[PDB]
Amino acid sequence: NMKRYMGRDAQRMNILAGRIIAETVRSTLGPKGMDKMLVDDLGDVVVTNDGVTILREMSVEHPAAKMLIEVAKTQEKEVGDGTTTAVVVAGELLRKAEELLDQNVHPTIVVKGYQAAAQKAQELLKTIACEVGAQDKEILTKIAMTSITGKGAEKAKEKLAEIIVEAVSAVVDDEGKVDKDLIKIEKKSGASIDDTELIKGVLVDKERVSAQMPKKVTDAKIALLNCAIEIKETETDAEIRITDPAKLMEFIEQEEKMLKDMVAEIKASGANVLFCQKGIDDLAQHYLAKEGIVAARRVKKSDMEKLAKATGANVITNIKDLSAQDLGDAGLVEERKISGDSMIFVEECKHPKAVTMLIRGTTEHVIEEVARAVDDAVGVVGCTIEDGRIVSGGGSTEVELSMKLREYAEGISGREQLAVRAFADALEVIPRTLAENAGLDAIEILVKVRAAHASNGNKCAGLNVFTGAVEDMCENGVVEPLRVKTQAIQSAAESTEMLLRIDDVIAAEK
Amino acid sequence: NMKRYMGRDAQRMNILAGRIIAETVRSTLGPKGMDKMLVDDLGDVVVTNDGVTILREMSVEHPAAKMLIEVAKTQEKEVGDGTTTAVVVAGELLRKAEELLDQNVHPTIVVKGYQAAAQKAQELLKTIACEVGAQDKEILTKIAMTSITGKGAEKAKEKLAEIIVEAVSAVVDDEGKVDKDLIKIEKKSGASIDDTELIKGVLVDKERVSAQMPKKVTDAKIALLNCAIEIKETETDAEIRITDPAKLMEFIEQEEKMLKDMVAEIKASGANVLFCQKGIDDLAQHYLAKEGIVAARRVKKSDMEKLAKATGANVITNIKDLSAQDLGDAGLVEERKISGDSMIFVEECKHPKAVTMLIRGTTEHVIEEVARAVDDAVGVVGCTIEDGRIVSGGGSTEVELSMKLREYAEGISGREQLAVRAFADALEVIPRTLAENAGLDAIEILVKVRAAHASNGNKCAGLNVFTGAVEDMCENGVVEPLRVKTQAIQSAAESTEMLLRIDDVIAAEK
Amino acid sequence: NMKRYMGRDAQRMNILAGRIIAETVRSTLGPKGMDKMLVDDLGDVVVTNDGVTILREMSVEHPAAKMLIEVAKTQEKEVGDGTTTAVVVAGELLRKAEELLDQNVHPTIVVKGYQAAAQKAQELLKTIACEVGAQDKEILTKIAMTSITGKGAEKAKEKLAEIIVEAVSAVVDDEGKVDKDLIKIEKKSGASIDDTELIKGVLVDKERVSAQMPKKVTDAKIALLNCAIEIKETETDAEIRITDPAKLMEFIEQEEKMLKDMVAEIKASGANVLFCQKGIDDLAQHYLAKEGIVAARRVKKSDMEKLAKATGANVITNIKDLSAQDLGDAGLVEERKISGDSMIFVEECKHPKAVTMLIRGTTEHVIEEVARAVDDAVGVVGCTIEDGRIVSGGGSTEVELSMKLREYAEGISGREQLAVRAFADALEVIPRTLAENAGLDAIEILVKVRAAHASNGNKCAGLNVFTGAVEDMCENGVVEPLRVKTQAIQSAAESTEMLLRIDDVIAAEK
Amino acid sequence: NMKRYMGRDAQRMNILAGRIIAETVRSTLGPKGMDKMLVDDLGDVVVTNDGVTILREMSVEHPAAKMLIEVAKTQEKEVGDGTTTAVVVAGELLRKAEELLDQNVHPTIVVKGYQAAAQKAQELLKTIACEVGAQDKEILTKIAMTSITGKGAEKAKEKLAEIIVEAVSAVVDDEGKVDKDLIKIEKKSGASIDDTELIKGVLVDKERVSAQMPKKVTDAKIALLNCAIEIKETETDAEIRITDPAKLMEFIEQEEKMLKDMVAEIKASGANVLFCQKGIDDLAQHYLAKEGIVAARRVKKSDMEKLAKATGANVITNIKDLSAQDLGDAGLVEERKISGDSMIFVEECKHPKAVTMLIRGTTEHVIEEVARAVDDAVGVVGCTIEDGRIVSGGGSTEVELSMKLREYAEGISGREQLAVRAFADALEVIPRTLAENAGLDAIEILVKVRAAHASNGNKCAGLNVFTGAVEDMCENGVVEPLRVKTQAIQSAAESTEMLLRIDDVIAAEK
């Protein structure tokens, strides 16, 4: 019952099917891209702009499509959004090989061509790289503004870019390995995007441990405890053997003394706020309250980590080693209710190594996609400070790229010319698809812009989709990180190279 | 319902079916070989070039095909890639026997012939053996370059061969038993092949045990512990019987003292990095951190083994025997995140007995097959230093081999001549299949190259598939280990010999 | 639904069905015999030459066939291979009785005849017995060379016979009860038969217990321990009741002391190699390593037994009784990897009472059947030294046997003549079937060889299947143990005798 | 359950499916074309080279494919073979529109382009027309030799072309409407093609009506009767009322007299051979035999028609009007058995207006396809004398056609350029597909031949598939009727034009 594909059969399936996946998602590309609604088997509803979410959620059957998950997953780790860009070009590359395969051009020649094209593209990528001010926050923000496109919340790119770039600039480390996961994205539905804000510290989704404890403490002295605040029990099994009535109270009171004195030791640190990863004994809560100590229980480990990054406090295992010099600082620690939801807010931190962006919004889908938009911008900004070099975006540079690729094809010649020239031909699909999704005549845009664009020193001329005509991309600030174009485009092809080597598909049906 | 085959019936099935398996995989052979896509019953997708993976993953039904698994499995242990070479010749040997069997040539005569052919081939194998510089790394690398063919990452054979041969030369032992499993292949998807590199030490896929511990230590003092760092519990069952309140704290504190002092003993070794195969008590982490000790927990035993090979450190069971002289060394021990994945890197080791090659790449399939390519090259290089003798490859030598096999057939005569001559005839299928898969007229190549090749002292003349014409294989460096051709070809036949003795197949259907 | 057979009905079934089993396996007989492929219900594949394997694996339905399992099973215990010989004759004996039964010859007369034939055959067996040098190893080897026929690895009978006969001569005991199970056959797929070898000692399929222990020790001092090397626990239930904190360390250290001192006692024996049938405590490994003791854990009991036979070491239960005089010796004990498989080799033993033959080969089937071939040769050689008397083989002697059986029939006369003469007629089927399977005219061979063979003193004239003509079997060394022909042939008939008494078959269907 | 296609959906289906039909039949094109085996639902076997047979016999499901039946059916009526030529180009035209449709080029623009291309092609067709001798039989035969290609009986084109062209030249009428159905193709399996021959007259598959009649008559006097030779019965119902015994014989004898005298009247015409479309009374046979009249009964109407064309005899209804001047002539009328099959042969006719080609051959398939080959040649020869103008064939002229089509595209410009240039691009697929089916590098042939072909006055340069290289088509006589290229190519596109207008497919499942 399972189908078996060899040679041309496998080619027809792999090419058409992967192309069909691309044909499905091609509409999502860029400022003019639209969105998709995916509902799973259990009936749960997801609204997405994200290609990876689309691929990982859609019930993908053909292996060749499943390959795109691997590529897009890597694209997520490096560049974030715009993966549609790579997919669409690959779809054309599949079509371009189909045409050459119909001529019976040897598959290894096509791949040989793409390898040479990758090497030549690397040179071209280094050539198009525009050096920019590595520390200029405002221009960096301008890049972030372009980064915030292809979602409906770019109307507020003003505040949004400010928060996102500020957050990244805050976490800048000597070494580029800066992990954007050190910037927390906190989601809370309710209200609208207008209430979104930057917290120079951390928001903890927990409740005040005891109702009687202070609700707000300004210059807090933060302690981090990962141990439970209870009567400690040994690892070795042990049992009390009582032989006299008074012992009943002596041992009960001993546990009272161990807890109480342990709390006195907590108090002896000077701590005024204490975060516990595990639980807190009811009586512990009582004494801590009487000691004026504000407590948070069962704090999620990753939150414990961000607390350390914000306050400077170190997680202590043994209270006996806990001293005042182990305490961290926060300009304000306060218990807050947002949309009536009790949470513990760590704000105004002195020298936070991590920060948290609070996102507000009308629905779960709103806050999911806005939060996703923030992660996306944050990734590309991170790359932008990681290599202070950019290129114009919007499909404009790919014209200049194909421009000289055609020259290489002419200098190479023969059948290899076909493979490289076809690559170049596919490289132009990006502006072509943008134009079509923008509702414009793509032939008009490509011909006319290509004519203007080529012109030796007219590099930045691209398409303005708002006025629907050729325009200088530079002054409008339509640019992209060098890294995003670099890794996405080159890898897009290099992964296809393996698919092109496939001449036999033997697949069982699940 | 089960089918039963005897005599000719069994012959027709065994010959056709095994031939069909060969017909399926024949396309995968050599520099011009293509790839296959296999998807299992659960829908999981595998992309492979490897014959053994193909046979062990494919749902093989006919026993005769299952036999090839046994041969290919041995081929893997000795020679690695190129198993297609043996399979294809065997397929022709099956066809050649079919023709002779249609004449009713006695099966034992065919086998008798192949036995004589194996013995004569051994003499011929010793004759074609070219002695080469046993320690010449660069020429060895040139061999490795040929070894890296039949995969799409040979574009980077420059760096790749350098790492692979360097790694093997590093682990050279007085005795040839050098086990290439002493060279670790570490896979990490992300980025592209470009980032692949040689680690003169070991990469450990674990996280820093305590967040507060040093993240980087240059000249580290490595200790290897296989015991858990916890309060030790006896093998004999034991229970504490408490009769006084103060005992509760005395025993709790006793465990604190046993742990703490045990840690002091760890500190007394001078160790600055400690690897634990089992777990580490939370409080242990605290004290070790305060002692400035960098710790790794739950370290995989095989990683513990490579750590010993890299640092010189010995795995200690009893801390009481742990002393500074038991410590090993590493030029750098550092906590790193790659693609945002926390790992512990042991680099720049002084005199590493094992090394680790880090492979980067765009997809899981990329890193699987590149890693497989590395294992393959490593095996054939190992054989190459194991016997410093080589032969030309590419099907060229097999012409010279059949050349004199024909002379033997003429000196032997009779019906035995048919068996030996048929063997020789089958021996030429290799260049023949390469030619066909290369898109060329195989008769043209065989006739014309055979004419040139024979010519007494024109041994190295083989086929250049890039220009598609006869060429001197020597100057182009198209060569293979003596061992690979030796074991693969001789065994290929010797296994068939048993199949030829089969005159009755009685098989139940699963 | 079950079928019921009486009288002639049962005769027709029993005779035809058992004959059909014989007709199936008759092709496997002798130097010219072929092989069979049996695949079970689970799809597992077995390749065999062995009749017992064929019968015990085949799904046998008819009871009469199941009877042959009992006979062949006994044949295995006494003579090993050649069981086809007995089966085929019995098949003819069934046919010969059918002819006589069609005349209504009384069943008890047929059996009465076979009883007399067994008695007369015993006299004839004693008469044909050729006395040979009981201790001549080389001629014994020549017998072993004939023993190695009917498998495809007789090409290497040179080395193979040398190892097999040497191994038997090594284990010769004053008493003939020598059990060939005292010679171990060790199988390792990989490489080819060429690497097969004799180990004057034992190969143990286990790993070095601690990585730090010596990997090779020449003149080893072997100790055999069947007890686990751990803190000993009493048979009586016991529990420690701790009342003071210091006890925690006192009891932990007590176990450290019991283990450590126990190891000191091990060291006090002088032992340098220790085999443990059970497990070894992790700390025990540490101390033993520090003491320079090479250890093997979880050693299979039968391996413990062969170790005793090789080294002279005695298995000790109580270490307290272990002394240096209990230690055994081995010329070399070494940790080896074969095909990358860690194993512990006990070689060069001084006065080994057992030896181990290492078999190499390309597939599992190779090593199974080669190992089976070794067991077979070993059994018939054992019989050959057990009674230093032989006869010519190849069906030649059975002519001389029938020759005088015909004389007995003539001296007996009457209906009894028919039974005995028919037995004699069946006795000639062996050379007849060999001839047919050899592709020759069986009537030509039987008539012509019978004419020459009879001739008073021309006993050794038999068939040379290689040149396909009559030849003196003696000079070509085509001979068999007296025992094999004796037990196999006589019993073959004596078991049939019971089947002939069956006049009623009432069998339920499973 | 039925599927519904709109817009792109319908485009993808129509384009792919029709292309797939083309991909199936493309292999059948030209001298190097191969054949197909089609077996219907009832199991009957058809072997064909003919596209129309392929389409009308294959179970075609998609309407777009069914459209090709309409085109090919017309192609059959005008040009006969080579329909694959049109189909393949259309398949590329579908692919070329797919590429333009993927750019969203307006469908009417594509069609507008093809309309202009048809008009320009008409001019180009008139331009390439080579005027040739209208009555030169031998050169005409040379054209017929090319016409006989793409079937395996062209080995005998010598005799075959001679018969076919002679037959056409024989039936030449002042007016071109000459219907080739006036040349009968008579099939008789048996013997081989060698016995094929031209009959200047007609072969009738009927038996001699009376065994006693002459078996052979040289200068026969032919009469054609379409009425039955029986006692005539009135249209009006009538009954005889007998009142006297003698009347019984009077009326019986009256019928004897009416028949007999009617026969005398037949004899009075002088006729010596008589063909009856209906039956012949038994007694009529008797008298006609006695009168020396050779008779054929139940003659098929179409055979009656060819008899008139051969002899000049006119079909008579009323014998009373039959006179000697109504008789036709034949040089020989004879009863013959071929392969033992009695038939009536009308040969050596004086001035035959129709002729019959007798085809012999080994199988039914042989005579079906050879007969089909004869019909095909006859059609294209007919066209060739219908307009005494030809062009080179073999894909050579289509290069020159596209050559100037490219010039038109350049002189037209804009988006219309794309449509026309794409047409031109598709026009080259013919030599491209020939090259591929010829086993050659199509890019090599197209590039190299295009380079030579273009060259102003180098028109006739095409591909010689026998030597596999460029060659002057003229001297080798590789030419085609002006009509065949004209009607086939232009119509091929004009039919596609309608398919391109399809934007909605609503199809029920049968």
Side-chain angles (χ1 to χ4, degrees), chain C residues 129 137 177 224 276 278 315 387 434 461 491:
Chain C
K137 182 179 178 182
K177 69 182 181 177
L224 301 177
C276 180
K278 297 180 180 179
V315 175
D387 184 356
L434 290 171
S491 292

Side-chain angles (χ1 to χ4, degrees), chain D residues 113-130 387 389 391 397 400-402 404-405 408 420 423 427 482-483 485-491 493-494 497:
Chain D
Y114 289 168
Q115 284 177 354
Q119 290 175 355
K120 292 294 180 181
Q122 180 180 3
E123 290 176 356
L124 291 173
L125 287 167
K126 291 180 180 180
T127 298
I128 61 172
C130 179
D387 184 356
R389 285 172 283 169
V391 298
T397 297
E400 183 175 56
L401 291 175
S402 65
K404 289 183 178 181
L405 283 171
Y408 290 160
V420 173
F423 178 81
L427 186 59
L482 179 63
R483 289 180 64 83
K485 296 290 182 180
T486 295
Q487 188 64 44
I489 294 169
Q490 177 176 357
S491 293
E494 289 175 355
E497 289 175 357

Side-chain angles (χ1 to χ4, degrees), chain A residues 70 74 241 501 503-504, chain B residues 33 35-37 242 362 364:
Chain A
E70 286 293 306
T74 298
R241 291 283 183 271
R501 295 180 61 87
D503 63 359
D504 183 357
Chain B
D35 295 312
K36 295 191 178 296
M37 183 179 286
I242 294 170
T362 300
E364 182 177 359

Side-chain angles (χ1 to χ4, degrees), chain D residues 246-274:
Chain D
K247 288 180 184 294
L248 288 170
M249 289 303 292
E250 288 174 355
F251 283 104
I252 289 169
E253 288 175 356
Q254 185 63 46
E255 284 187 353
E256 291 174 357
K257 287 181 180 181
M258 289 189 286
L259 183 64
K260 185 176 180 181
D261 286 347
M262 183 181 73
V263 169
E265 291 171 356
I266 293 169
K267 178 68 172 180
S269 69
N272 294 328
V273 177
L274 174 65

Side-chain angles (χ1 to χ4, degrees), chain B residues 117-324:
Chain B
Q119 290 175 355
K120 292 294 180 181
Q122 180 180 3
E123 290 176 356
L124 291 173
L125 287 167
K126 291 180 180 180
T127 298
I128 61 172
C130 179
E131 183 180 1
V132 297
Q135 299 180 0
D136 189 313
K137 182 179 178 182
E138 185 176 0
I139 291 171
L140 179 60
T141 300
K142 293 178 182 179
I143 294 167
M145 289 178 181
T146 300
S147 297
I148 304 169
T149 58
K151 61 277 294 176
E154 66 183 298
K155 65 183 181 182
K157 68 182 185 296
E158 290 178 357
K159 181 65 175 180
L160 292 173
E162 180 179 358
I163 289 169
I164 290 166
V165 170
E166 182 177 359
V168 171
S169 65
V171 301
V172 170
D173 296 310
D174 286 349
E175 297 181 357
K177 69 182 181 177
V178 177
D179 180 355
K180 65 176 175 66
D181 285 347
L182 297 175
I183 299 171
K184 181 176 180 178
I185 300 172
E186 176 59 54
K187 298 168 282 185
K188 186 67 181 169
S189 67
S192 66
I193 292 168
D194 290 349
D195 285 346
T196 187
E197 62 184 359
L198 176 64
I199 304 299
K200 297 181 180 178
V202 178
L203 302 180
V204 179
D205 188 7
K206 297 291 180 182
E207 298 181 359
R208 185 173 67 261
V209 171
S210 174
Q212 302 303 315
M213 288 180 181
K215 298 181 179 180
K216 186 176 181 179
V217 179
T218 306
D219 189 6
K221 301 294 182 181
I222 290 76
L224 301 177
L225 181 67
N226 62 2
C227 296
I229 304 171
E230 63 181 0
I231 289 75
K232 184 173 181 178
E233 293 184 359
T234 59
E235 292 302 307
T236 303
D237 287 349
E239 298 182 359
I240 298 167
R241 291 283 183 271
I242 294 170
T243 63
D244 290 291
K247 288 180 184 294
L248 288 170
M249 289 303 292
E250 288 174 355
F251 284 104
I252 289 169
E253 288 175 356
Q254 185 63 46
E255 284 187 353
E256 291 174 357
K257 287 181 180 181
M258 289 189 286
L259 183 64
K260 185 176 180 181
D261 286 347
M262 183 181 73
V263 169
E265 291 171 356
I266 292 169
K267 178 68 172 180
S269 69
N272 294 328
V273 177
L274 174 65
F275 297 91
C276 180
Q277 182 176 356
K278 297 180 180 179
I280 302 176
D281 187 289
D282 290 348
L283 183 55
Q285 299 171 3
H286 186 178
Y287 294 162
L288 290 171
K290 289 293 183 180
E291 294 301 307
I293 299 169
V294 177
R297 70 182 180 184
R298 298 186 189 177
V299 177
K300 184 175 181 179
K301 182 176 178 179
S302 66
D303 286 344
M304 291 296 290
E305 291 174 356
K306 295 293 182 289
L307 287 169
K309 290 292 183 180
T311 64
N314 296 331
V315 175
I316 302 300
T317 302
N318 188 346
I319 291 168
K320 291 180 178 179
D321 291 345
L322 182 65
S323 67

Side-chain angles (χ1 to χ4, degrees), chain A residues 8 12 19-20 23 95-96 99 102-105 415 418 432 436 441 443, chain D residues 8 12 19-20 23 95-96 99 102-105 415 418 432 436 441 443:
Chain A
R8 178 174 177 87
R12 288 180 285 171
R19 182 175 183 82
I20 289 166
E23 184 66 12
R95 183 183 67 79
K96 291 294 181 183
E99 181 175 56
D102 287 345
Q103 297 177 5
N104 290 335
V105 174
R415 291 188 295 276
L418 291 172
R432 190 179 73 81
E436 287 178 355
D441 186 308
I443 292 168
Chain D
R8 178 174 177 87
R12 288 180 285 171
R19 182 175 183 82
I20 289 166
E23 184 66 12
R95 183 183 67 79
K96 291 294 181 183
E99 181 175 56
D102 287 345
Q103 297 177 5
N104 290 335
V105 174
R415 291 188 295 276
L418 292 172
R432 190 180 73 81
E436 287 178 355
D441 186 308
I443 292 168

Side-chain angles (χ1 to χ4, degrees), chain C residues 187-190 359-372:
Chain C
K187 298 168 282 185
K188 186 67 181 170
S189 67
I359 298 170
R360 300 292 304 279
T362 300
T363 78
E364 182 177 359
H365 287 163
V366 167
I367 62 172
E368 279 299 309
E369 291 303 306
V370 168
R372 184 59 173 166

Side-chain angles (χ1 to χ4, degrees), chain C residues 83-385:
Chain C
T83 60
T84 303
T85 303
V87 171
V88 170
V89 173
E92 284 302 309
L93 288 173
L94 291 172
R95 183 183 67 79
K96 291 294 181 183
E98 183 181 1
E99 181 175 56
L100 293 174
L101 287 171
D102 287 345
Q103 297 177 5
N104 290 335
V105 174
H106 203 291
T108 59
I109 293 171
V110 173
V111 172
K112 181 179 178 181
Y114 289 168
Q115 284 177 354
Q119 290 175 355
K120 292 294 180 181
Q122 180 180 3
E123 290 176 356
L124 291 173
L125 287 167
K126 291 180 180 180
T127 298
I128 61 172
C130 179
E131 183 180 1
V132 297
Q135 299 180 0
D136 189 313
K137 182 179 178 182
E138 185 176 0
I139 291 171
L140 179 60
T141 300
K142 293 178 182 179
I143 294 167
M145 289 178 181
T146 300
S147 297
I148 304 169
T149 58
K151 61 277 294 176
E154 66 183 298
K155 65 183 181 182
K157 68 182 185 296
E158 290 178 357
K159 181 65 175 180
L160 292 173
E162 180 179 358
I163 289 169
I164 290 166
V165 170
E166 182 177 359
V168 171
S169 65
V171 301
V172 170
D173 296 310
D174 286 349
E175 297 181 356
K177 69 182 181 177
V178 177
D179 180 355
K180 65 176 175 66
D181 285 347
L182 297 175
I183 299 171
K184 181 176 180 178
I185 300 172
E186 176 59 54
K187 298 168 282 185
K188 186 67 181 170
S189 67
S192 66
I193 292 168
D194 290 348
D195 285 346
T196 188
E197 62 184 359
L198 176 64
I199 304 299
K200 297 181 180 178
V202 178
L203 302 181
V204 179
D205 188 7
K206 297 291 180 182
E207 298 181 359
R208 185 173 67 261
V209 171
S210 174
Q212 302 303 316
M213 288 180 181
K215 298 181 179 180
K216 186 175 181 179
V217 179
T218 306
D219 189 6
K221 301 294 182 181
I222 290 76
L224 301 177
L225 181 67
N226 62 2
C227 296
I229 304 171
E230 63 181 0
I231 289 75
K232 184 173 181 178
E233 293 184 359
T234 59
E235 292 302 307
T236 303
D237 287 349
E239 298 182 359
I240 298 167
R241 291 283 183 271
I242 294 170
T243 63
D244 290 291
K247 288 180 184 294
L248 288 170
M249 289 303 292
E250 289 174 355
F251 283 104
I252 289 169
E253 288 175 356
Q254 185 63 46
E255 284 187 353
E256 291 174 357
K257 287 181 180 181
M258 289 189 286
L259 183 64
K260 185 176 180 181
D261 286 347
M262 183 181 73
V263 169
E265 291 171 356
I266 292 169
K267 178 68 172 181
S269 69
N272 294 328
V273 177
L274 174 65
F275 297 91
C276 180
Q277 182 176 356
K278 297 180 180 179
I280 302 176
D281 187 289
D282 290 348
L283 183 55
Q285 299 171 3
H286 186 178
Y287 294 162
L288 290 171
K290 289 293 183 180
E291 294 301 307
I293 299 169
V294 177
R297 70 182 180 184
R298 297 186 189 177
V299 177
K300 184 175 181 179
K301 182 177 178 179
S302 66
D303 286 344
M304 291 296 290
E305 291 174 356
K306 295 293 182 289
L307 287 169
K309 290 292 183 180
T311 64
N314 296 331
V315 175
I316 302 300
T317 302
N318 188 346
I319 291 168
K320 291 180 178 179
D321 291 345
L322 182 65
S323 67
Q325 292 180 359
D326 298 313
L327 301 175
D329 291 348
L332 177 65
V333 175
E334 61 176 0
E335 197 283 308
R336 297 286 299 277
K337 293 182 180 181
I338 303 298
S339 301
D341 182 357
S342 176
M343 297 178 69
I344 300 170
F345 289 177
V346 179
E347 299 184 0
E348 298 181 357
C349 296
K350 290 182 180 180
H351 304 284
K353 296 179 181 182
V355 296
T356 304
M357 180 177 182
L358 173 62
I359 298 170
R360 300 292 304 279
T362 300
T363 78
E364 182 177 359
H365 287 163
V366 167
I367 62 172
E368 279 299 309
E369 291 303 306
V370 168
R372 184 59 173 166
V374 170
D375 182 61
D376 291 348
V378 166
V380 300
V381 169
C383 290
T384 301
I385 66 168

